[PDB]
Amino acid sequence: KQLIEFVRWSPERAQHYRNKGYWIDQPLTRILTVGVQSHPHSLAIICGERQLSYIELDRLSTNLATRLAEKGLGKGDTALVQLPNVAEFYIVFFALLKAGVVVLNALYSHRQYELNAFIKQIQPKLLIGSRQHEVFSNNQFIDSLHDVNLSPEIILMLNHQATDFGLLDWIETPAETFVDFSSTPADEVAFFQLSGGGTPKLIPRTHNDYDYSVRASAEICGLNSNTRLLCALPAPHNFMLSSPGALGVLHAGGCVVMAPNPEPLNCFSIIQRHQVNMASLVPSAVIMWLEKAAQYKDQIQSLKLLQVGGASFPESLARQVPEVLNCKLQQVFGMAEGLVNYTRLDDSDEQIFTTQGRPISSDDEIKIVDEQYREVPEGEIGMLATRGPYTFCGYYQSPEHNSQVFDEDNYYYSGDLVQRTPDGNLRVVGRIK
Numbered sequence: 001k002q003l004i005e006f007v008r009w010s011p012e013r014a015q016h017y018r019n020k021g022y023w024i025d026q027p028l029t030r031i032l033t034v035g036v037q038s039h040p041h042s043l044a045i046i047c048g049e050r051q052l053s054y055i056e057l058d059r060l061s062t063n064l065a066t067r068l069a070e071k072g073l074g075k076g077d078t079a080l081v082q083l084p085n086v087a088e089f090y091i092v093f094f095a096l097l098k099a100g101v102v103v104l105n106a107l108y109s110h111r112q113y114e115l116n117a118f119i120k121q122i123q124p125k126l127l128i129g130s131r132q133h134e135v136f137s138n139n140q141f142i143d144s145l146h147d148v149n150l151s152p153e154i155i156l157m158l159n160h161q162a163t164d165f166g167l168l169d170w171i172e173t174p175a176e177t178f179v180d181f182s183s184t185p186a187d188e189v190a191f192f193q194l195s196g197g198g199t200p201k202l203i204p205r206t207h208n209d210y211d212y213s214v215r216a217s218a219e220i221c222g223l224n225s226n227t228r229l230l231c232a233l234p235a236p237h238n239f240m241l242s243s244p245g246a247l248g249v250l251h252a253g254g255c256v257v258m259a260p261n262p263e264p265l266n267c268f269s270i271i272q273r274h275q276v277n278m279a280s281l282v283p284s285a286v287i288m289w290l291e292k293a294a295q296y297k298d299q300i301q302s303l304k305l306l307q308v309g310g311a312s313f314p315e316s317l318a319r320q321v322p323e324v325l326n327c328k329l330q331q332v333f334g335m336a337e338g339l340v341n342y343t344r345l346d347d348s349d350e351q352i353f354t355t356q357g358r359p360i361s362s363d364d365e366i367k368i369v370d371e372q373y374r375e376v377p378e379g380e381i382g383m384l385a386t387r388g389p390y391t392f393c394g395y396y397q398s399p400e401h402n403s404q405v406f407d408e409d410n411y412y413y414s415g416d417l418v419q420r421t422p423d424g425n426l427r428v429v430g431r432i433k
Ligand SMILES: [Ca+2]
Pocket: 051, 052, 053, 056
């Protein structure tokens, strides 16, 4: 009965975002539904030797949704998911969105401490993990949850033991009985993003706001049905999921090509095999690729666009991208809390190499402010403050911290130090608390 609580946009802002066509009041499953209508047999996911079409992705996620609904998991309920970079991540994500279960996707790199904190905050009735993960290699962590009355009703495991419920079995074989289910409402919470590094804080995201960020990013990045995007960063990460990420590529009718991580030789062979034309990396991974790229020129020719985001990316490195990787560069400065900035595909070389671009939306509002929260003279460095159609209004169940990072006009303070360039783009120069 009771939907997950979160901080709403003011009704004036909500109406404005609908009037502009940003919020279209559709669940995130729209991406899959529409793809199935238009091109059911196009490839949606390539993973190792597997090829999942749009209709297959739809069927398999429907399968799992029916099994969860059959067991009473639905609206008002939450789930914790921790899976590596495999097709099952998306099958599960779309299953939970279909079922109306609010999901927190932990990074596969998260350990006992973070997972415990996550469980304490959302009290999940469903836990999906992998027996190959250190935390679920034995039963010590799972058993500990009984002790604190935080045991989930259902545990599913990839690489399951004979005693476990098998994730693949719940995906493959449909429910015995029919129980009705549907997504949470479009202006209500779909899932929790996580802040970028104490433990990550939980960011409620609605269908409206996330779907908008996805659709608009897909247009900015020129995605189309021929896009084949390498997913070498962690699948659950905002950048890899939505900027424009796997969801963006599915929105545009393209195909996601999985890699376990950004190790260059493996990535290069995957790029060659599947003729990958887009990838998204952090600067430390770009350095790894640049070191090997000259020798494996042939394998990576098909790359047409590389996004780089997440961390400091100096000009000297940026210029090497088209030179050595033989593809266009796009810089991306985003946050899991909302605001994403992209250099545009028709930006000048100078903009592309020396800036972190400009916001998705004409209605991303930005203030750049000094120590007294006054707006700085044009071009000067200040603290970034932002609000918009896909920027959150508060962390989950955190009124004290929210009062510290939002001003009275509900602008969010990310801590980033930035300056507006004369060309209109942003340059990230630092961080302050
Ligand atoms: Ca297939």
